[PDB]
Design an enzyme around this catalytic site. Structure first.
Site, PDB file in Angstrom:
ATOM      1  NE  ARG A  49      -3.442   2.434   2.829  1.00  0.00           N
ATOM      2  CZ  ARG A  49      -3.573   3.049   4.001  1.00  0.00           C
ATOM      3  NH1 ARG A  49      -3.003   2.578   5.110  1.00  0.00           N
ATOM      4  NH2 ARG A  49      -4.265   4.182   4.062  1.00  0.00           N
ATOM      5  CG  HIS A  53      -1.549   5.385  -0.478  1.00  0.00           C
ATOM      6  ND1 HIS A  53      -2.262   5.906   0.585  1.00  0.00           N
ATOM      7  CD2 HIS A  53      -2.409   4.588  -1.155  1.00  0.00           C
ATOM      8  CE1 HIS A  53      -3.489   5.416   0.564  1.00  0.00           C
ATOM      9  NE2 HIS A  53      -3.606   4.617  -0.482  1.00  0.00           N
ATOM     10  CG  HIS A 176      -7.870  -4.101  -2.409  1.00  0.00           C
ATOM     11  ND1 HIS A 176      -8.904  -3.250  -2.745  1.00  0.00           N
ATOM     12  CD2 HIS A 176      -6.866  -3.313  -1.952  1.00  0.00           C
ATOM     13  CE1 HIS A 176      -8.542  -2.003  -2.491  1.00  0.00           C
ATOM     14  NE2 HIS A 176      -7.304  -2.012  -2.024  1.00  0.00           N
ATOM     15  CD1 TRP A 192     -11.340  -6.281  -0.380  1.00  0.00           C
ATOM     16  CD2 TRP A 192      -9.474  -6.086   0.851  1.00  0.00           C
ATOM     17  NE1 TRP A 192     -11.051  -4.939  -0.265  1.00  0.00           N
ATOM     18  CE2 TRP A 192      -9.909  -4.793   0.480  1.00  0.00           C
ATOM     19  CE3 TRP A 192      -8.306  -6.213   1.613  1.00  0.00           C
ATOM     20  CZ2 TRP A 192      -9.225  -3.638   0.856  1.00  0.00           C
ATOM     21  CZ3 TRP A 192      -7.630  -5.061   1.994  1.00  0.00           C
ATOM     22  CH2 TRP A 192      -8.093  -3.790   1.612  1.00  0.00           C
TER      23      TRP A 192
HETATM   24  C1  HEM Z   1      -9.834   2.823  -6.292  1.00  0.00           C
HETATM   25  C2  HEM Z   1      -8.638   2.387  -5.869  1.00  0.00           C
HETATM   26  C3  HEM Z   1      -8.321   2.031  -4.390  1.00  0.00           C
HETATM   27  C4  HEM Z   1      -9.012   2.331  -3.278  1.00  0.00           C
HETATM   28  C5  HEM Z   1     -10.296   3.183  -3.134  1.00  0.00           C
HETATM   29  C6  HEM Z   1      -8.309   1.742  -2.149  1.00  0.00           C
HETATM   30  C7  HEM Z   1      -8.686   1.833  -0.827  1.00  0.00           C
HETATM   31  C8  HEM Z   1      -8.110   1.155   0.230  1.00  0.00           C
HETATM   32  C9  HEM Z   1      -8.513   1.234   1.624  1.00  0.00           C
HETATM   33  C10 HEM Z   1      -9.680   2.106   2.153  1.00  0.00           C
HETATM   34  C11 HEM Z   1      -7.709   0.437   2.346  1.00  0.00           C
HETATM   35  C12 HEM Z   1      -7.735   0.168   3.871  1.00  0.00           C
HETATM   36  C13 HEM Z   1      -6.613   0.926   4.580  1.00  0.00           C
HETATM   37  C14 HEM Z   1      -6.699   0.635   6.064  1.00  0.00           C
HETATM   38  O1  HEM Z   1      -7.807   0.751   6.644  1.00  0.00           O
HETATM   39  O2  HEM Z   1      -5.661   0.301   6.667  1.00  0.00           O
HETATM   40  C15 HEM Z   1      -6.774  -0.183   1.434  1.00  0.00           C
HETATM   41  C16 HEM Z   1      -5.784  -1.074   1.793  1.00  0.00           C
HETATM   42  C17 HEM Z   1      -4.861  -1.614   0.920  1.00  0.00           C
HETATM   43  N1  HEM Z   1      -4.669  -1.225  -0.400  1.00  0.00           N
HETATM   44 FE1  HEM Z   1      -6.108  -0.317  -1.582  1.00  0.00          FE
HETATM   45  N2  HEM Z   1      -7.207   1.054  -2.624  1.00  0.00           N
HETATM   46  C18 HEM Z   1      -7.184   1.205  -3.997  1.00  0.00           C
HETATM   47  C19 HEM Z   1      -6.226   0.686  -4.846  1.00  0.00           C
HETATM   48  C20 HEM Z   1      -5.116  -0.041  -4.478  1.00  0.00           C
HETATM   49  C21 HEM Z   1      -3.994  -0.389  -5.327  1.00  0.00           C
HETATM   50  C22 HEM Z   1      -3.894   0.067  -6.806  1.00  0.00           C
HETATM   51  C23 HEM Z   1      -3.121  -1.104  -4.584  1.00  0.00           C
HETATM   52  C24 HEM Z   1      -1.766  -1.747  -4.951  1.00  0.00           C
HETATM   53  C25 HEM Z   1      -1.412  -2.064  -6.214  1.00  0.00           C
HETATM   54  C26 HEM Z   1      -3.693  -1.249  -3.261  1.00  0.00           C
HETATM   55  C27 HEM Z   1      -3.128  -1.941  -2.204  1.00  0.00           C
HETATM   56  C28 HEM Z   1      -3.654  -2.015  -0.920  1.00  0.00           C
HETATM   57  C29 HEM Z   1      -3.215  -2.928   0.120  1.00  0.00           C
HETATM   58  C30 HEM Z   1      -2.115  -4.009  -0.045  1.00  0.00           C
HETATM   59  C31 HEM Z   1      -3.947  -2.700   1.218  1.00  0.00           C
HETATM   60  C32 HEM Z   1      -3.849  -3.444   2.573  1.00  0.00           C
HETATM   61  C33 HEM Z   1      -2.980  -2.611   3.531  1.00  0.00           C
HETATM   62  C34 HEM Z   1      -2.829  -3.209   4.929  1.00  0.00           C
HETATM   63  O3  HEM Z   1      -3.275  -4.357   5.188  1.00  0.00           O
HETATM   64  O4  HEM Z   1      -2.234  -2.531   5.812  1.00  0.00           O
HETATM   65  N3  HEM Z   1      -4.904  -0.580  -3.229  1.00  0.00           N
HETATM   66  N4  HEM Z   1      -7.038   0.295   0.156  1.00  0.00           N
END
Ligand code: HEM
Length: 295
Positions: A49, A53, A176, A192
């Site tokens: 993530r 970002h 995800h 997820w």
């Molecule tokens: C419309 C696009 C996206 C949205 C709205 C989104 C939104 C989110 C949200 C709300 C979380 C939860 C964060 C938390 O509560 O700790 C999350 C986690 C995460 N995102 Fe996405 N994301 C998007 C695209 C992506 C992309 C493109 C990647 C990587 C290629 C990604 C990788 C991750 C990962 C690995 C997590 C888990 C982080 C953890 O477990 O600490 N996301 N994302």
């Protein structure tokens, strides 16, 4: 007048593949060591993530933001509400940076994501060095990362700003499969899927095979929940509401190898957006996993 900046990649002084493989190994060894983080998920998902970002601030229209400048190290971007929780990934990388102080911040942040994907048994991601730290006044303003409480039209339009098409969007969102949402960070709660620190096509399989119900969570945001204990963000679920996205979701749910290939291309592209590489630049590196090295 506002011409798009050109950010030229510059290899760190006298460094080559073996140097960055050592940085990879330090990241990968600490990932194995700190297994307790986030109820034993480990630091893999938060590093992925983080890489996303620091890259997803990019605006293709004026080449502001993006991974090149390493500007997440500055207070304005570090404290962006969209970045809540990523401080854990920054703190994980601090001892890596102390051991290898020659690496740029952007190179370290982006390499962290590549290492995490590969060490979680994902596809190889070719990676190029040469990002150069830029000053604090180059830090992008908050608000460029996407809102999860949106639909497919918003997702498609948003990723246009990152030069991503439908296939690239659906592939990238497959990350995800990793990690989970945390109520204190994003206002969403739950993972997820089940295999939270192994890179697979589980995201697409769960989207298509689980029975989802729209529900309010404890932060009063609505999310899609299954009886198995999984969740989907509204933007996640929009990939099966939109007919063009749904076709690609079905394709990846049936063929993890095709998903791996497409994710590897799109993730390298995401991490490289905004960077101009000299034609004389070294070829992309493919790092070996710890397993491939007997380490
Ligand atoms: C419309 C696009 C996206 C949205 C709205 C989104 C939104 C989110 C949200 C709300 C979380 C939860 C964060 C938390 O509560 O700790 C999350 C986690 C995460 N995102 Fe996405 N994301 C998007 C695209 C992506 C992309 C493109 C990647 C990587 C290629 C990604 C990788 C991750 C990962 C690995 C997590 C888990 C982080 C953890 O477990 O600490 N996301 N994302």
């Amino acid at each position: 007048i506002t011409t798009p900046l050109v950010h030229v990649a510059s290899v760190e002084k006298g460094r080559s593949y073996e140097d960055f493989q050592k940085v990879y190994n330090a990241i990968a060894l600490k990932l194995r060591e700190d297994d307790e983080y986030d109820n034993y998920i480990g630091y893999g998902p938060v590093l992925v993530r983080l890489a996303w970002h620091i890259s997803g601030t990019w605006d293709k229209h004026d080449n502001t933001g993006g991974s090149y400048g390493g500007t997440y190290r500055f207070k304005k971007e570090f404290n962006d509400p969209s970045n809540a929780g990523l401080q854990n990934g920054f703190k994980f990388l601090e001892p890596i940076h102390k051991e290898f102080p020659w690496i740029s911040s952007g190179d370290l942040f982006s390499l962290g994501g590549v290492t995490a994907v590969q060490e979680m048994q994902g596809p190889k991601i070719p990676w190029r060095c040469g990002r150069v730290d830029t000053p604090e006044d180059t830090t992008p303003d908050n608000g460029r990362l996407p809102d999860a409480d949106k639909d497919a039209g918003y997702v498609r339009t948003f990723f246009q700003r990152l030069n991503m098409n439908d296939r690239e969007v659906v592939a990238l969102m497959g990350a995800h499969a990793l990690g989970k949402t945390h109520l204190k960070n994003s206002g969403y709660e739950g993972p997820w899927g089940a295999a939270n620190n192994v890179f697979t096509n589980e995201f697409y399989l769960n989207l298509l095979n689980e029975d989802w119900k729209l529900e309010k969570n404890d932060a009063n945001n609505e999310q899609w929940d299954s009886k198995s204990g999984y969740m989907m963000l509204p933007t996640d679920y929009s990939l099966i509401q939109d007919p063009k996205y749904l076709s690609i979701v079905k394709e990846y749910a049936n063929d993890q190898d095709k998903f791996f290939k497409d994710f590897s291309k799109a993730f390298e592209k995401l991490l490289e957006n905004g960077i101009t590489f000299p034609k004389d630049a070294p070829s992309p590196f493919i790092f070996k996993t710890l397993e491939e090295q007997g380490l």
